[PDB]
Symmetry: D2
């Protein structure tokens, strides 16, 4: 169901920067190879989870990329969110393409 193998067009790449108490978490799908952004083929959303070591995954953010050509407006599948996270663990990003399903990426915090 969820594809874990890396894919330049579909894999949601996670970058982590610690700014004081906040984690600055960048998620981008198609960073190096641009994914199409068309009404019938686009990256629709990304979910961000934090799974602290020894605990359940906690939903951190849900980002919907809503524009795909309406009046020539396009939302690129890239977002920056901010969270206070306690302890060590791994971030989990899940993204959805309207034709090619779901893709997952994990990155150690």
């Amino acid at each position: 169901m969820i594809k874990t193998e890396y894919n330049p067009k579909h894999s949601p790449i996670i970058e982590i920067e610690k700014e004081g108490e906040l984690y600055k978490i960048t998620i981008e799908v198609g960073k190096e190879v641009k994914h199409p952004n068309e009404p019938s083929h686009h990256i629709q959303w990304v979910d961000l989870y934090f799974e602290p070591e020894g605990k359940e995954p906690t939903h951190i953010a849900r980002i919907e990329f809503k524009a795909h050509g309406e009046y020539n407006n396009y939302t690129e599948p890239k977002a920056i969110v901010y969270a206070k996270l306690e302890g060590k663990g791994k971030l989990i990003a899940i993204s959805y393409c309207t034709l090619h399903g779901l893709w997952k990426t994990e990155k150690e915090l």
Copy 2:
């Protein structure tokens, strides 16, 4: 229903930076006075629209801030999204607080 009056704790502040073809759009609620982030009182989400002059508002992004204390994890009400926007108009941010309703901010593009 929607409050348009400015409020330091609840108004979603919009910042715009043009990066190539993309508008880099930062939205933060409680920028100068931090809003509480508690299970029973928090900023839950922000909707971002672009209304080109003379046209209908186009939904650009929907961001849900999902963590509000679960395992001491907190999602800050701040997000950066990226969009291709055609023509002139105004951006519209709508944010929701679980106790004080909905708040709107407009910014000319």
Copy 3:
């Protein structure tokens, strides 16, 4: 921004049924005249609020209708949700069409 006038194709019609402690709340967009459900033109979501008399609007449900032709699958803009609501007030439904903007309907509880 939000259109309040009734429209057979876009207005989210609210029906309310009381079942014990629960309100069974049906929302349908395009009840009498079906709205197109196409990649470039469809009803994307509906938000349901409850505004008790003299209080702030409380967000009750958010429903995203996600399929609009992918592999000939279509999500109809109709949903039934269930809530316990305290006191008297009105339900408020807001729906979004990817071409014709936002539409609002109110119904007294």
Copy 4:
């Protein structure tokens, strides 16, 4: 990450009814044993996918249960959605509890 084992409190139970061209799809979490609905412990959302045999999973609906005590209002983790689905396959429901992670249920169409 996703829990597939049956659990009376957390598993999103799927029911399917064919009404003309439409599948009437009911999803309820905590059907036989009620799950807590509290600010710090509640069922937040359910995602519904359709995976036609030999194809990728198509996102059908996303339902957020938004009220968990705000002004004594509670959204129950139960929703009914409607979709036109082509061919045979299986429905996939994924639900999220703010403390006990993600839970999955599949049902043959």
